[PDB]
Amino acid sequence: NVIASCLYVACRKEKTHHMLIDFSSRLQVSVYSIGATFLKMVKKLHITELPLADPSLFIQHFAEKLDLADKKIKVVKDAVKLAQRMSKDWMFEGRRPAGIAGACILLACRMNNLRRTHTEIVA
Amino acid sequence: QLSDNAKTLHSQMMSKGIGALFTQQELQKQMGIGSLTDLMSIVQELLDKNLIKLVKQNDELKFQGVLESEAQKKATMSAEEALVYSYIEASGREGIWSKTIKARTNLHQHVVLKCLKSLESQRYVKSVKSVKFPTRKIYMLYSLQPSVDELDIEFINSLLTIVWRFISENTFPNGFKNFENGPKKNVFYAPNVKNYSTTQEILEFITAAQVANVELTPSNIRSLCEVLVYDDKLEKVTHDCYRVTLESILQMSIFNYFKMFPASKHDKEVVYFDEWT
DNA sequence: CCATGGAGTCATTTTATCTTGTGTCACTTACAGAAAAAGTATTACTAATATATGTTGAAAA
DNA sequence: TTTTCAACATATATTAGTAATACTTTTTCTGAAGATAAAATGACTCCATGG
């Protein structure tokens, strides 16, 4: 839980794609205990605001394992401006980002008329 | 018969059992009438049924009678502890130690710990930190503690300073330090005619107690006196005979480090015992 | 008193050893575990919130 | 039958107070050829007694 968050905030500040829920499954643990310890070392240190992630980053790496073909890049821009407006349309806030990202991907994918199941997305 | 030869072969054990020296040869010494694989089938099962045991020493392998106390004990013990536990009590006196159980059991230190701690809750083995260095925690039976260890730590001189005071009185008459010469007045008459030790008498004087301890042997007393031979508080003459060096005066040009004090400020000309080295 | 036996010293081999081996560019790439200390995670409480999550199941098509 | 709801619930985080236990850490703390030599070889000789 210590080396976890200590490794975490870094790749957070660099604004890359890595995710706490993703970060735990290296262990049997709960994505709470890690989250708890994390948010505590936010108190015992004093840390800047910068690490605010958006789906616009995660949709890149999520798109990688989607298989498919070159079209996804098109889908990428199809998804991106989608999610962007979704952030603008005001129903983005206060939600676990990885989920709404996957939702955007399902949309643009269907927008590009392919068949990819929900399981295949949440994987 | 399993139950019959079980109980009568337990009867030769509970009566005598040929002590600990009993090997399988003594079986044929008493009852050899049974066929080999049969008497051994029931030996094997009674050890499985924990009505007999086997000890590992010398030629062949030893057997002994065992009751349900330690039998239900070891059957209640885990498969880990199974060979471990009974192998531990093999010492029974001196105990055995951590890594030397690891090689014999062919386990890690990972697992042998938890079964030991299990035996700690069980309290059939106790942590013992012996004479040799306290890195050990050798383990003997929680019940028995015969061991090699006065004690190895302080309150030695506590009694030394007392015995010295008596030994002093044994030499010439008592202290007699007031004016220039009070001692001995030529040791009573003819100091030669007083031929005297302290030795054995110490033990009778040690009876005084006034301290928390047990008694002590003539042997260790001799060492107690050897120290004051080395400190040269007193003197070793003619075996157990002992005198004092008159260095009770040490209690209170020249030679006598005491009654002397250094200057040790300012002036740089002094005699150290270092700065040549 | 003298030839002898025994040893003590003193050349003499044969084994165990170590320093060398032409020059110049031009790139290249202290062990492990033991114990003590510090600190913490539950372990209950409301108590508001608002997602996730599961299931299920009920309700509808 | 399936789908949408719903709904039930339960974590999830704060701030506390305890108090006690258990549990991880950390921090001590020790149990290639030709000189050089070394030794076995052997002869020399002092020095022993005895017929």
In the 3-class helix/strand/coil scheme, how is chain A assigned residue by residue?
A: CHHHHHHHHHHHHCCCCCCHHHHHCCCCCCCCHHHHHHHHHHHHCCCCCCCCCCHHHHHHHHHHCCCCCCHHHHHHHHHHHHHHHHHHCCCCCCCCHHHHHHHHHHHHHHHCCCCCCHHHHHC
B187: left (phi over 0), alpha (psi -120 to 50) or beta: left
Q: Residue B207 to residues A92, A118, B35: CA-CA distances in angstroms?
A: 92, 92, 64
Cα dihedral angle (B46, B51, B55, B61), rounded to 10 degrees? -30
Contact indicator for B82, B133 with CB cutoff of 8 Å: no
Q: What is the Cα–Cα distance from B157 to B93, expressed in whole angstroms?
A: 31
> Which residues have CB under 7 A from strand C?
A 33, 36-37, 40, 94-96, 99; B 98, 109, 113, 135, 137
On the CB side of B238, CA atoms within 13 Å amount to: 6
Q: What is the Cα–Cα distance from A18 to B180, expressed in whole angstroms?
A: 95
Give strand letter and number of the nucleotide nearest A42 (CA to C1'). Answer: D13
Q: Taking the mean position of all CA atoms in its chain, how far away is CA A85?
A: 17
For residue A43, give both structure tokens.
């108190």
Whether CB of A35 is under 7 Å from strand D: the answer is yes
For the CA of A37 and the C1' of C39, the distance in angstroms is 14
Q: What is the Cα–Cα distance from A86 to A104, expressed in whole angstroms?
A: 9
For residue B51, give both structure tokens.
């009505």
A53: left (phi over 0), alpha (psi -120 to 50) or beta: beta
For the CA of B121 and the C1' of D20, the distance in angstroms is 21
For the CA of A37 and the C1' of D21, the distance in angstroms is 21
Q: Is the dihedral of CA B116, B121, B123, B129 positive or negative?
A: positive
Resolution, expressed in angstroms to one decimal:
4.1
Q: What is the Cα–Cα distance from A54 to A88, expressed in whole angstroms?
A: 12
Q: What is the Cα–Cα distance from B35 to B199, expressed in whole angstroms?
A: 66
Whether CB of A6 is under 7 Å from strand D: the answer is no
Q: Taking the mean position of all CA atoms in its chain, how far away is CA A93?
A: 14
Query: Hey, how many other C-beta atoms are within 10 angstroms of the C-beta on A91?
Result: 10
Q: What is the Cα–Cα distance from B1 to B201, expressed in whole angstroms?
A: 66
For the CA of B61 and the C1' of C15, the distance in angstroms is 53
B123: left (phi over 0), alpha (psi -120 to 50) or beta: left
Q: What is the Cα–Cα distance from A53 to A59, expressed in whole angstroms?
A: 11
Instruction: Please report where in the chains the tokens 């030695």 appear, as a residue.
Output: B156
Instruction: Please report where in the chains the tokens 């002397």 appear, as a residue.
Output: B260
For residue B221, give both structure tokens.
């007393």
Q: What is the Cα–Cα distance from B268 to A48, expressed in whole angstroms?
A: 63
Closest CA to A53 of A9, A88, A89, A3: A9
A68: left (phi over 0), alpha (psi -120 to 50) or beta: left
For residue A49, give both structure tokens.
């605001």
> Phi and psi dihedrals of A5, rounded to 5?
-60, -40
Q: What is the Cα–Cα distance from A122 to B119, expressed in whole angstroms?
A: 49
- Sequence-ordered list of residues with C-beta below 8 angstroms from that of A123, at least 6 positions apart, any chain: A65
> Phi and psi dihedrals of B139, rounded to 5?
-120, 115
For residue B26, give both structure tokens.
């003594």
Q: Is the dihedral of CA B139, B141, B143, B149 positive or negative?
A: negative
Q: What is the Cα–Cα distance from B118 to B125, expressed in whole angstroms?
A: 10
> Residue type at A34?
I
Angle between helices B218-230 and B157-171 (to 10 degrees): 80
* SS3 letters across chain B: CHHHHHHHHHHHHHHCCCCCCCECHHHHHHCCCCCHHHHHHHHHHHHHCCCEEEECCCCCCEEEECCHHHHHHHHHCCHHHHHHHHHHCCCCCCCECHHHHHHHHCCCHHHHHHHHHHHHHHCCEEEECCCCCCCCCEEEECCCCCCCCCCCCCCCHHHHHHHHHHHHHHHCCCCCCCCCCCCCCCCCCCHHHCCCCCCCHHHHHHCCCCCCCCCCCHHHHHHHHHHHHHCCCEEECCCCCEEECCCHHHHCCCCCCCCCCCCCCCCCCCCCCCCCC
End-to-end CA distance of chain B: 85
Q: Residue B7 to residues B38, B49, B75, B260: CA-CA distances in angstroms?
A: 15, 12, 19, 84
Q: Residue B232 to residues B164, B203, B244: CA-CA distances in angstroms?
A: 11, 22, 8
For the CA of A5 and the C1' of D25, the distance in angstroms is 17
For residue A25, give both structure tokens.
């499954």
Whether CB of B276 is under 7 Å from strand D: the answer is no
Give strand letter and number of the nucleotide nearest B134 (CA to C1'). Answer: D30
Q: Which nucleotides of D are covered by protein (CB under 7 A)?
A: 11-14, 25, 30-31
Contact indicator for B110, B98 with CB cutoff of 8 Å: no
Contact indicator for B141, B89 with CB cutoff of 8 Å: yes
Q: Residue-wise over A93-111: b if at least 16 C-beta within 10 A, else e? A: eeeebbebbbbbbbbbbee
> Residue type at B274?
D
Contact indicator for B125, B113 with CB cutoff of 8 Å: no
